[PDB]
Amino acid sequence: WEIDPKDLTFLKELGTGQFGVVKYGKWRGQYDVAIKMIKEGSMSEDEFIEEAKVMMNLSHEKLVQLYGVCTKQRPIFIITEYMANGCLLNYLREMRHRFQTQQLLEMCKDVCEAMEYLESKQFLHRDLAARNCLVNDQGVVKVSDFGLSRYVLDDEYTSSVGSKFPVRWSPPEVLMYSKFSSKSDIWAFGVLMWEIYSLGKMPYERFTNSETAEHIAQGLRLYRPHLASEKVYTIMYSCWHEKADERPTFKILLSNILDVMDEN
Ligand SMILES: Cc1c(NC(=O)c2ccc(C(C)(C)C)cc2)cccc1-c1cc(Nc2ccc(C(=O)N3CCOCC3)cn2)c(=O)n(C)c1
C-alpha cells in the first residue's frame, strides 16, 4: 500500500527511534497513525521496499499494523497504527503500583497471540522486548516493529558486541552464531514476560552486555519476579532452554497461558 503523503496530517512529535523521527498524525483527517520519517542512511531502504509487502499483509489484532509506505519522496515514510499509551516498558513503570496480577497475565496473552500469528506466518520479529510492544487507550498490548531489525544500518545495533544489540533478549545461538529462528523469538518472549512481571525492570541490571552473554552461556537465568506465581515462572523459564529445539512454540505457550487463566 503506497499511501499518498497528501493524505497525512502531521500533528505531534512522538520522539526518535532507530530510524529517526516518528510523528503522530491523521490519515484523511480521521484515522490516528504514527509516521516514521526514515532518516537517510539509517535503513537498507531498497532492501526494505523490495520486501515490504509481506510485512503489510501481517494482520492481527495484537500487532501494531504497518498500514503502508510513502516511497516517492525522500525521506521515505512508514505509516503504522497509533497506540495512545506508548511503549509497554514505560507503561509498566508508570503504572507500577496499580497492576493486578491478572492484568499482567493478560499482557502476556496479548503478546503471545501476536507471536503465535507471526510464528504461523514463519515471520520472525528479531527484536521482541517490552520496548517494542505498545499499549493502546484501553490497555491492550500489541507487538510493534516486527521484522524491521533486518533493515537497520547501524554497526552498534547489528553487531552482537555493539552497544545497541539486544543482548539481554538473545539466546546463546544468536549471541554466538547469529542464528535467528522462531526459537530465538521464544527466548525473547520469556525475557519479555520477565519484564512484565518485574513491572519494567532491566533484565540483568548491573551486568554489562558481555557479562550477560558470558553468564547466560554458562546457564545463569533471570530470577522469579515477586509477582510471578510458580506456574507463570515455569512458563517464562521454558523459553530459556539452552538448546533451541527444547523450547516451546508460541502455540504451546499460548495454551499454557490460557490454562493458567482458566485455573485462575
Ligand atoms: C515506535 C516508536 C519509536 N520507535 C521506532 O520507530 C523504532 C524503529 C525501529 C526499531 C527496531 C528496528 C530496532 C526494532 C524499533 C523502534 C520511536 C518513537 C515513537 C514510536 C511510536 C510511539 C507511539 N505512541 C506513543 C504514544 C504516546 C507517547 C507518550 O509520550 N506518552 C504516553 C501516554 O502517557 C503520556 C506520555 C509516546 N508514544 C505509537 O503509537 N507508535 C505506533 C510509535
Coordinates of C-alpha atoms and ligand atoms in Angstrom, one line a residue:
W1 CA 0.0 0.0 0.0
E2 CA 1.6 3.2 -1.3
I3 CA 0.0 5.9 0.8
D4 CA -0.4 9.4 -0.7
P5 CA 1.5 11.7 1.6
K6 CA -1.1 14.4 0.8
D7 CA -3.5 12.3 2.9
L8 CA -1.3 12.7 6.0
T9 CA -1.6 15.5 8.5
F10 CA 1.2 15.8 11.0
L11 CA 0.1 16.7 14.5
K12 CA 2.7 15.9 17.2
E13 CA 6.3 14.8 17.7
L14 CA 6.5 11.3 19.3
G15 CA 10.2 11.2 19.7
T16 CA 13.1 9.4 17.9
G17 CA 13.8 5.7 17.4
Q18 CA 16.3 3.6 15.4
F19 CA 15.2 5.1 12.1
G20 CA 14.8 8.7 13.3
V21 CA 11.8 10.9 14.0
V22 CA 8.4 9.5 14.5
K23 CA 5.3 11.7 14.4
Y24 CA 1.6 11.3 15.4
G25 CA -0.8 12.4 12.8
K26 CA -4.0 11.6 10.9
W27 CA -4.8 9.8 7.7
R28 CA -7.5 11.5 5.7
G29 CA -8.4 13.6 8.7
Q30 CA -9.9 10.7 10.6
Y31 CA -7.6 7.8 11.4
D32 CA -4.8 8.1 14.0
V33 CA -1.5 7.0 12.7
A34 CA 2.2 7.1 13.5
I35 CA 4.6 8.2 10.8
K36 CA 8.2 7.1 10.8
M37 CA 10.3 9.5 8.8
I38 CA 13.2 7.2 7.8
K39 CA 16.5 9.1 8.5
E40 CA 18.8 9.0 5.4
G41 CA 21.4 6.3 5.9
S42 CA 19.7 4.6 8.8
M43 CA 17.9 1.9 6.8
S44 CA 18.6 -0.5 3.9
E45 CA 15.8 1.2 2.0
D46 CA 16.0 -0.5 -1.3
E47 CA 16.0 -3.8 0.6
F48 CA 13.0 -2.9 2.7
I49 CA 11.0 -1.6 -0.2
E50 CA 11.7 -4.6 -2.3
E51 CA 10.5 -6.8 0.6
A52 CA 7.8 -4.8 2.4
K53 CA 4.5 -6.2 1.1
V54 CA 4.8 -9.3 3.4
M55 CA 5.0 -7.1 6.4
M56 CA 1.9 -5.0 5.4
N57 CA -0.1 -8.2 4.9
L58 CA 0.6 -9.2 8.5
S59 CA -2.8 -8.5 10.0
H60 CA -3.7 -9.4 13.6
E61 CA -5.5 -7.5 16.4
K62 CA -2.4 -7.9 18.6
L63 CA 0.1 -6.5 16.1
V64 CA 0.7 -2.8 15.6
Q65 CA -0.3 -2.8 11.9
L66 CA 2.0 -1.4 9.2
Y67 CA -0.6 0.4 7.1
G68 CA 1.6 1.4 4.2
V69 CA 4.6 3.4 3.0
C70 CA 5.5 6.6 1.2
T71 CA 8.4 5.9 -1.2
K72 CA 8.1 8.5 -4.0
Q73 CA 9.9 11.1 -1.9
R74 CA 12.9 11.5 0.4
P75 CA 12.8 10.6 3.3
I76 CA 10.5 7.6 2.9
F77 CA 7.7 7.2 5.4
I78 CA 6.4 4.1 7.2
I79 CA 2.8 4.6 8.4
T80 CA 1.5 2.4 11.3
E81 CA -1.3 2.0 13.8
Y82 CA -1.2 4.6 16.6
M83 CA -1.1 3.4 20.3
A84 CA -2.1 6.2 22.7
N85 CA -0.3 4.8 25.8
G86 CA 3.1 4.4 24.1
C87 CA 5.6 1.6 24.7
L88 CA 4.9 -1.2 27.2
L89 CA 8.2 -0.7 29.1
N90 CA 7.3 2.9 30.1
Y91 CA 3.7 1.9 30.7
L92 CA 4.7 -0.8 33.2
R93 CA 7.0 1.6 35.0
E94 CA 4.5 4.5 35.1
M95 CA 1.6 2.3 36.4
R96 CA 3.7 0.0 38.5
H97 CA 1.6 0.3 41.7
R98 CA -1.8 -0.2 40.0
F99 CA -1.5 -3.5 38.2
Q100 CA -3.2 -6.6 39.4
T101 CA -1.5 -9.9 38.6
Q102 CA -4.4 -10.9 36.3
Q103 CA -3.7 -7.8 34.2
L104 CA 0.0 -8.8 33.9
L105 CA -1.0 -12.3 32.6
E106 CA -3.4 -10.6 30.1
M107 CA -0.5 -8.6 28.8
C108 CA 1.5 -11.9 28.3
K109 CA -1.5 -13.4 26.5
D110 CA -1.8 -10.4 24.1
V111 CA 1.8 -10.7 23.1
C112 CA 1.7 -14.4 22.9
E113 CA -1.3 -14.2 20.5
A114 CA 0.6 -11.8 18.2
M115 CA 3.7 -14.1 18.3
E116 CA 1.7 -17.2 17.5
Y117 CA 0.3 -15.4 14.5
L118 CA 3.8 -14.4 13.4
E119 CA 5.0 -17.9 14.0
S120 CA 2.2 -19.3 11.8
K121 CA 3.4 -17.0 9.0
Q122 CA 7.0 -18.1 9.5
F123 CA 7.8 -14.4 10.2
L124 CA 10.5 -13.5 12.8
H125 CA 10.3 -10.4 15.0
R126 CA 14.0 -10.5 15.8
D127 CA 13.8 -7.7 18.5
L128 CA 10.9 -8.7 20.8
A129 CA 11.1 -6.8 24.1
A130 CA 8.8 -4.6 26.2
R131 CA 10.3 -1.5 24.5
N132 CA 8.9 -3.0 21.2
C133 CA 5.4 -3.5 22.4
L134 CA 2.9 -0.6 22.5
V135 CA -0.3 -0.1 24.6
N136 CA -3.5 1.4 23.3
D137 CA -6.0 3.6 25.1
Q138 CA -7.9 0.6 26.5
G139 CA -4.7 -1.2 27.9
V140 CA -4.4 -3.7 25.1
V141 CA -0.8 -4.6 24.4
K142 CA 0.4 -5.1 20.8
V143 CA 3.7 -6.1 19.3
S144 CA 5.5 -3.4 17.2
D145 CA 8.2 -3.1 14.6
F146 CA 8.4 -6.9 13.9
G147 CA 10.9 -7.7 11.2
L148 CA 12.4 -4.2 10.8
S149 CA 15.7 -5.0 12.6
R150 CA 16.8 -6.7 9.4
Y151 CA 17.0 -3.3 7.7
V152 CA 18.9 -1.4 10.3
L153 CA 22.2 0.3 9.1
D154 CA 24.0 0.9 12.4
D155 CA 27.0 -1.2 13.4
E156 CA 26.3 -0.6 17.1
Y157 CA 22.9 -2.4 16.6
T158 CA 23.7 -5.1 14.1
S159 CA 26.9 -6.4 15.8
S160 CA 26.4 -8.7 18.7
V161 CA 29.2 -6.8 20.5
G162 CA 27.6 -3.4 19.7
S163 CA 26.2 -1.3 22.4
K164 CA 22.6 -1.4 20.9
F165 CA 22.3 -5.1 20.1
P166 CA 19.5 -6.7 22.2
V167 CA 21.9 -8.9 24.1
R168 CA 19.7 -9.3 27.1
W169 CA 16.8 -10.7 24.9
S170 CA 19.1 -13.1 22.9
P171 CA 19.6 -16.8 23.2
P172 CA 23.1 -18.3 23.1
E173 CA 22.8 -19.3 19.4
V174 CA 22.1 -15.7 18.4
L175 CA 25.0 -14.4 20.6
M176 CA 27.4 -17.0 19.2
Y177 CA 26.3 -17.7 15.6
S178 CA 23.6 -15.0 14.7
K179 CA 21.2 -17.9 14.3
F180 CA 17.8 -16.3 14.4
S181 CA 14.8 -18.5 14.3
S182 CA 11.3 -19.0 15.8
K183 CA 13.1 -20.2 18.9
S184 CA 15.1 -17.0 19.3
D185 CA 11.8 -15.1 19.4
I186 CA 10.7 -17.7 22.0
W187 CA 13.7 -16.8 24.2
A188 CA 13.0 -13.1 23.9
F189 CA 9.3 -13.7 24.8
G190 CA 10.4 -15.3 28.0
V191 CA 12.5 -12.2 28.9
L192 CA 9.5 -10.0 27.9
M193 CA 7.3 -12.0 30.4
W194 CA 10.0 -11.3 33.0
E195 CA 9.9 -7.6 32.1
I196 CA 6.1 -7.6 32.6
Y197 CA 6.1 -9.4 35.9
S198 CA 9.0 -7.3 37.2
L199 CA 7.0 -4.2 36.2
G200 CA 9.6 -2.9 33.8
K201 CA 13.0 -3.7 35.4
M202 CA 16.0 -4.0 33.2
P203 CA 17.0 -7.7 32.8
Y204 CA 20.4 -8.5 34.3
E205 CA 20.7 -5.0 35.6
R206 CA 24.3 -4.1 36.7
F207 CA 25.6 -6.7 34.3
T208 CA 27.2 -5.4 31.1
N209 CA 26.1 -6.9 27.8
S210 CA 29.2 -9.1 27.6
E211 CA 28.9 -10.2 31.2
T212 CA 25.2 -11.1 30.4
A213 CA 26.3 -13.1 27.3
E214 CA 29.0 -14.8 29.3
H215 CA 26.8 -15.8 32.1
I216 CA 23.7 -16.9 30.2
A217 CA 26.0 -19.1 28.1
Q218 CA 27.0 -20.7 31.4
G219 CA 23.4 -21.2 32.5
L220 CA 22.6 -18.1 34.5
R221 CA 18.9 -17.3 34.2
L222 CA 16.7 -14.4 35.4
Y223 CA 15.2 -14.9 38.9
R224 CA 11.4 -15.2 39.5
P225 CA 9.9 -11.8 40.0
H226 CA 7.9 -11.4 43.2
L227 CA 4.5 -11.0 41.3
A228 CA 5.0 -14.2 39.2
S229 CA 3.4 -17.3 40.5
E230 CA 5.4 -20.5 40.1
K231 CA 3.1 -21.6 37.3
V232 CA 3.9 -18.3 35.5
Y233 CA 7.6 -18.6 36.2
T234 CA 7.6 -22.2 34.7
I235 CA 6.2 -20.8 31.5
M236 CA 8.7 -18.0 31.1
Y237 CA 11.6 -20.3 32.2
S238 CA 10.6 -22.8 29.5
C239 CA 11.6 -20.2 26.9
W240 CA 15.2 -20.3 28.1
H241 CA 16.3 -23.8 27.4
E242 CA 19.9 -23.7 26.3
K243 CA 19.1 -25.9 23.3
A244 CA 16.7 -24.2 20.9
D245 CA 14.8 -27.4 20.0
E246 CA 13.8 -27.9 23.6
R247 CA 12.0 -24.6 23.7
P248 CA 8.2 -24.5 23.2
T249 CA 6.3 -23.0 20.3
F250 CA 4.1 -19.9 20.7
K251 CA 1.2 -22.2 20.2
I252 CA 2.2 -24.2 23.2
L253 CA 3.0 -21.1 25.2
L254 CA -0.5 -19.7 24.4
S255 CA -2.1 -22.9 25.6
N256 CA 0.0 -22.7 28.8
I257 CA -1.1 -19.1 29.5
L258 CA -4.8 -19.9 28.8
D259 CA -4.6 -22.8 31.2
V260 CA -3.3 -20.6 34.0
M261 CA -6.1 -18.1 33.3
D262 CA -8.6 -20.9 33.4
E263 CA -7.2 -22.2 36.7
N264 CA -7.3 -18.7 38.0
Ligands
LIG1 C1 7.8 3.0 17.7 C2 8.3 4.4 18.1 C3 9.7 4.7 18.0 N1 10.5 3.7 17.7 C4 10.7 3.2 16.4 O1 10.2 3.8 15.4 C5 11.5 2.0 16.1 C6 12.2 1.7 14.9 C7 12.9 0.6 14.7 C8 13.0 -0.4 15.7 C9 13.9 -1.7 15.6 C10 14.3 -1.9 14.1 C11 15.1 -1.6 16.4 C12 13.1 -3.0 16.1 C13 12.4 -0.1 16.9 C14 11.6 1.0 17.1 C15 10.2 5.9 18.3 C16 9.3 7.0 18.7 C17 7.9 6.7 18.7 C18 7.3 5.4 18.4 C19 5.8 5.2 18.5 C20 5.1 5.8 19.5 C21 3.7 5.6 19.7 N2 2.8 6.1 20.6 C22 3.1 7.0 21.7 C23 2.0 7.5 22.4 C24 2.3 8.3 23.5 C25 3.6 8.6 23.9 C26 3.8 9.5 25.1 O2 4.5 10.5 25.0 N3 3.1 9.3 26.4 C27 2.2 8.1 26.6 C28 0.9 8.4 27.5 O3 1.3 9.0 28.7 C29 1.9 10.2 28.5 C30 3.3 10.1 27.6 C31 4.6 8.1 23.1 N4 4.4 7.3 22.1 C32 3.0 4.9 18.7 O4 1.7 4.7 18.7 N5 3.7 4.3 17.6 C33 3.0 3.5 16.6 C34 5.1 4.5 17.6

